[PDB]
């Protein structure tokens, strides 16, 4: 058989949220756990040997991800290619656009992801779930508490068969703890799905007039994810979820995560803890728990590092202090001053975020606050959204 | 003589306040009263018939201001040209920076005004002031209260003379009631000044180590204004001031500002109005006092306008109400959708203001709060920030 795989990347209008750190760079290639969003999936589908083309699909400009993509294929050689659906059409109507280039090498069955996702990945268990249970798709699935049923809605399976007897997008009406999980595959007759209600039923949402009419039919499956999921809309969640895959990294492969734990010149790392080959470090700094730094920055002397996620060419000077933060690009933090939030990924200011290259002076505060790009801060701000 | 023009500019660091608005067009271009900030002061170059080259300096970008400046010339046929100091030295050090270029046509004396000023700008009567006086500058003062000197410091002022024998920039220990506007002019000597403070003595602050030590020595003297001031680096400020200058389109030459005042095809003019001739108006709409309405907006009927300002591309949809507020380009305000604000130009959220092409749907409601540019509200908001 042969395999493709095709990934949402959404435009301009979905990183609406992202703002401080989109003006820089766009919502898949904001580094997670030091490696961009979408840099993840990517990582799964090298695990299938059979898998050959991959398509990222969204109305952004190919001028962004071409530079991207050119460095994927020299690491996993995979073929990357990025398509801009001048005609969004949400996600149905987006894949039907160009099914001729996806299709194009006859594969077998094509995967369909969400960028904004953040799960295991088991590509090859669904895989193989979806060969046996045949069908169109096979979705995926995974338990969650009859309480978390606000965020989604209803979802019907029967275990016995794991075929989905009902799904309904928002109005749950009462549920069944099943919630979906946004990464899908199907077999090539989906494309043949969505003529028989582009062109004979005639802006089509897969998840409302496909997802929905498929239900007593046998064709629709479901897999368990037996993991972790968390969807990442939110700029604060970029860290509950960089937690998760650094867990990841540390269950699999843990010598690709700095594991110093002590001081030979290698700073006191306490765990979850990635640190780029380009960076400076001074073995007075304790880097805690679930931290993600970038390339090309400069840390300095007793710095504490916890719960935070930094970006490129930024500067910490001495003393500093970061807690539930996301510096951005070429930002400047002054000496003995504090970047810290609560933490709470329900609140908007729990996780205080800096735009790039905003300068913190020295001794000044931030807690709990956003600040824009190319901005310089004299005085200690608390609770407040930042121009 | 011969009289040469130089106005500050600033770079995209100084209108990091305008942000929703500058992230599209800069601060010194954002139109007040229908005209750009800097349009007020160059248009008041003109009544100086000895008056030749004109020069905005700032470390902006020459890209912007070339476009801008070609269309200047052709309305009062002046020569002005942008330079982008690539070496900022706030005030002092950008003018003595090519000196050469100022005094190229040996002009007896430099006008030396600031971007974001907002008074009545009478250039030929401090002209003619300081050819009486004589010395290096004449500065300009205005009759405020003591209690408003939080906002700058002390000011001395000797009334005979009109000499400067004082001056703090800040710490005030006791006033005297007047302050700086900000408009300047001095004479070729005042060149040979900086020289003796930037060579002699050796980032340089005009009003620190220029103005301050320039007292006792009768050099510096003062010119009452006798009309309005208001400094605006805030952009809520952008009414307040806007007002002042459609006043003074209605004290002189008030046939310049749209007088409809009835139902002849024309809306329901309440005073004080500025409308483009480019505008489409329905009659059914009451367009009340300090409204700027720009080149290109679609007015929808029987809409109310009151205390705003709206730029251009705009489009206003059925019974629509717009108050204390600043419409950002391309914006789209749906029908019976409302974005009022309380008008407190102390309060951050006193002026709302919507961002570049900012999408209000139907009935969505805009209290008192920030939208930024590329953005659609379904939902109302209300004393919020939103990014």
Not at 23 to 47: D, E, R
Request: charged share 20%.
């Amino acid at each position: 058989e042969k395999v493709v795989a095709v990934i949402m990347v959404g435009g301009p209008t979905k990183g609406t949220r992202f703002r401080p750190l989109s003006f820089n760079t766009p919502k898949p290639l904001i580094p997670l756990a030091g490696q961009p969003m979408i840099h993840h999936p990517i990582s799964a589908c090298k695990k299938i040997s059979n898998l050959a083309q991959i398509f990222l699909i969204g109305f952004y400009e190919e001028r962004e991800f071409a530079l991207y993509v050119s460095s994927i294929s020299n690491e996993l050689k995979i073929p990357v290619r990025y398509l801009k659906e001048d005609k969004p059409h949400g996600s149905a109507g987006a894949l039907y656009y160009f099914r001729d280039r996806i299709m194009e090498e006859k594969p077998s069955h094509v995967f369909l992801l969400n960028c904004d996702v953040c799960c295991s990945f088991p590509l090859q268990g669904i895989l193989d779930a979806h060969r046996r249970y045949g069908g169109i798709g096979t979705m995926l699935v995974i338990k969650v508490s009859a309480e978390a049923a606000s965020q989604f809605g209803e979802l019907i399976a029967d275990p016995d068969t794991k075929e989905l007897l009902h799904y309904t997008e928002k109005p749950e009406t009462f549920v069944s703890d099943l919630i979906n999980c946004g990464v899908y595959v199907f077999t090539s007759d989906i494309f043949n799905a969505i003529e028989e209600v582009y062109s004979q039923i005639r802006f089509v949402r897969l998840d409302q007039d496909i997802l929905s009419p498929l239900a007593g039919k046998k064709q629709l499956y479901t897999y368990e994810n037996k993991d972790f999921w968390e969807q990442i809309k939110t700029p604060g969640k970029s860290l509950k979820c960089s937690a998760l895959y650094l867990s990841q990294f540390r269950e699999t492969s843990p010598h690709i995560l700095a594991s110093g734990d002590g001081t030979n010149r290698k700073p006191t790392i306490i765990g979850d803890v990635y640190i780029h080959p380009s960076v400076k470090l001074h073995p007075t700094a304790k880097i805690g728990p679930n931290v993600s730094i970038s390339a090309n920055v400069r840390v300095g002397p007793g710095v504490r590092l916890i719960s935070c996620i930094i970006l490129d060419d930024v500067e910490i000077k001495e003393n500093a202090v970061v807690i539930n933060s996301i510096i951005g690009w070429k930002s400047s933090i002054g000496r003995w001053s504090r970047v810290q939030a609560s933490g709470d990924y329900n609140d908007r200011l729990g996780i205080t975020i800096l735009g790039e290259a905003v300068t913190v002076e020295d001794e000044v505060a931030v807690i709990g606050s956003i600040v824009l790009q190319n901005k310089t801060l004299n005085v200690s701000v608390q609770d407040d959204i930042i121009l």
